[PDB]
Ligand SMILES: NC(=O)[C@H]1CCCN(C(=O)NCC2CC2)C1
């Protein structure tokens with residue numbers, strides 16, 4: 001579990017969104033596994049606006065932050081799970097690292113701010129849903 005709190009927005013994995021998230025919906029995209037809802041309180045996270053390929057992510061199943069090298073956001077095939085059929089997930093970045101069910105929502109960050117959140121795992125790979133292209137998170 002986990003979310004990004006930027007401005008008056010809450011960014012979560014779409015597959016983990018709550019009823020309150022759907023009832024206060026700003027934007028959602030199943031192909032990216034992202035959903036954004038509105039918040040009453042202002043958050044403290046800031047979004048990175050860059051093309052970094054190195055950063056640090058939080059792994060809840062290890063209680064540890066790990067430094068990683070990650071691929072550029074792209075269209076990647078993700079196997080069938082209990083949340084989605086086998087499909088191409090867009091804006092996904094992969095790295096070598098531990099990720100098991102429960103780790104979605106952990107933040108990946110670089111020197112510029114939050115880059116994205118954990119969205120996939122297994123086989124010694126961790127995948128992150130990028131948010132750096134969502135420029136509207138910084139305003140309104
Ligand atoms: N983005 C996806 O299609 C996910 C949905 C949850 C299931 N899935 C995973 O890779 N889970 C393993 C660890 C928790 C990350 C694919």
Ligand SMILES: [Zn+2]
Pocket residue numbers: 048049050051052110111112113
């Ligand atoms: Zn950066």
